[PDB]
Design brief:
This protein is mostly helical and 63 residues long. 65% of the residues lie in helices and 0% in strands. GO terms for molecular function: DNA binding.
């Protein structure tokens, strides 16, 4: 699940949504909606992908 990943990987890294947002250079609010799974094709997909350290494909589907 999109949301599942985006929360749990953050938890895994030990970053809150706040530090994650900052590393990504977005804001916690975007990360909040994203965590809830509101975004599908976000402009900052690869940024999230890098900051988490997961594939685009994993974040899309799960690979």
């Amino acid at each position: 699940s999109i949301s599942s990943r985006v929360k749990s990987k953050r938890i895994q890294l030990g970053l809150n949504q706040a530090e994650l947002a900052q590393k990504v250079g977005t804001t916690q609010q975007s990360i909040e909606q994203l965590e809830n799974g509101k975004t599908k094709r976000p402009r900052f997909l690869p940024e999230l992908a890098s900051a988490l350290g997961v594939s685009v494909d994993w974040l899309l589907n799960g690979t």
